Design an enzyme around this catalytic site. Structure first.
Site, PDB file in Angstrom:
ATOM      1  N   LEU A 176     -12.549   3.491  -8.572  1.00 60.49           N
ATOM      2  CA  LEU A 176     -12.101   1.688  -8.046  1.00 60.49           C
ATOM      3  C   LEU A 176     -13.632   1.525  -8.039  1.00 60.49           C
ATOM      4  O   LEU A 176     -14.206   0.997  -6.637  1.00 60.49           O
ATOM      5  CB  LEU A 176     -11.414   1.647  -7.570  1.00 60.49           C
ATOM      6  CG  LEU A 176     -10.130   2.543  -7.342  1.00 60.49           C
ATOM      7  CD1 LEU A 176      -9.109   1.899  -6.855  1.00 60.49           C
ATOM      8  CD2 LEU A 176      -9.369   2.070  -9.134  1.00 60.49           C
ATOM      9  N   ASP A 209       0.210   0.688   4.561  1.00 61.37           N
ATOM     10  CA  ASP A 209      -0.880   0.287   5.061  1.00 61.37           C
ATOM     11  C   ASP A 209      -1.553  -0.465   3.872  1.00 61.37           C
ATOM     12  O   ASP A 209      -2.327  -0.348   3.768  1.00 61.37           O
ATOM     13  CB  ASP A 209      -2.004   1.717   6.055  1.00 61.37           C
ATOM     14  CG  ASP A 209      -2.748   0.749   6.498  1.00 61.37           C
ATOM     15  OD1 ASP A 209      -3.366  -0.087   7.004  1.00 61.37           O
ATOM     16  OD2 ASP A 209      -4.686   1.437   6.291  1.00 61.37           O
TER      17      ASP A 209
END
EC number: 2.7.11.1
Length: 293
Positions: A95, A140
């Site tokens: 990414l 998270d």
């Protein structure tokens, strides 16, 4: 429908991928590194974990989630020896497009619309919807864990980092903290700052005074009550009363992103004015999440 389980390979990763070991040095510290498949030559990312109970769970839960297109894919996992220590070497899709809000802040025209916010919130809601539908809570969901495939404007946003992920049981409210995260991210997308009180921070604006109404006027004046209601539902204090992912993904603001007004928002312009505070924003989200998971 039946999916394969996770095969952890034991052969040295360097049989399969090019790494070289000054790359590996920076890895056991925590940095995700870039690596290449030998057969195919495709670039991938590598996370190095110390092998324990917990790392094993993270990788397991993440493997179940990988095939979600709004969740970063695990390609392979290795159990190898590196340094003096036994390691999980996790190979993932790279990414390269950076964090969600970095893109918004760096826009040259400082222009960002309600419709774009809606589109992004749909992406994040899809990943959460998948997890909650297989009884995983991420726990998270925060700015640094939302990343774009590439630098290009049509890059896909993906959820990463299962280090706090957990199996749930429904009668449980572990999923609540993911819904709060959505409310916080949505709030920042619409105005450029989080819905946080602080006792702070000079040469800068105080965006929300303590105890003050949560939708202040300069930035929130053109935002509908409908949207403020969706946010109050996500941020509701009591988990028993907090909106669920089913309600969220069924809301017209999410379901019909295309029909959302292109209201011009202050977000990008505010992210730039307040960029010295960004580290503290993240720090406060991280602390809040730790009291709330």
């Amino acid at each position: 429908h039946v999916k394969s389980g996770l095969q952890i390979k034991k052969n040295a990763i360097i049989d399969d991928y090019k790494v070289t070991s000054q790359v590996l040095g920076l890895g056991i510290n925590g940095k995700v590194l870039q690596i290449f498949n030998k057969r195919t030559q495709e670039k991938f990312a590598l996370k190095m974990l110390q092998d324990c109970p917990k790392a094993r769970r993270e990788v397991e839960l993440h493997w179940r989630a990988s095939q979600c297109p709004h969740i970063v894919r695990i390609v392979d996992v290795y159990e190898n020896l590196y340094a003096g220590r036994k390691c999980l070497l996790i190979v993932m899709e790279c990414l390269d497009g950076g964090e969600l809000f970095s893109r918004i802040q760096d826009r040259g025209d400082q222009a960002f619309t309600e419709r774009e916010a809606s589109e992004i919130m749909k992406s994040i809601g899809e990943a959460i919807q998948y997890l909650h539908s297989i009884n995983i809570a991420h726990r998270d969901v925060k700015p640094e864990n939302l990343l774009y495939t590439s630098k290009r404007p049509n890059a896909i946003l993906k959820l990463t980092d299962f280090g706090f992920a957990k199996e749930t049981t429904g009668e449980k409210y572990d999923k609540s903290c993911d819904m709060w995260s959505l409310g916080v991210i949505m709030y920042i997308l619409l105005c450029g700052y989080p819905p946080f009180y602080s006792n702070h921070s000079p040469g800068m604006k105080t965006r929300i005074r303590m105890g003050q109404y949560e939708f202040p006027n300069p930035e929130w004046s053109e935002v509908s009550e409908e949207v403020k209601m969706l946010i109050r539902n996500l941020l509701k204090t009591e988990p028993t009363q907090r909106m669920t992912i089913t309600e969220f993904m069924n809301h017209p603001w999410i379901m019909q992103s295309t029909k959302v007004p292109q209201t011009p928002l202050h977000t990008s312009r505010v992210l730039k004015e307040d960029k010295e505070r960004w580290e503290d924003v993240k720090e406060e989200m991280t602390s809040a999440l730790a009291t709330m998971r």
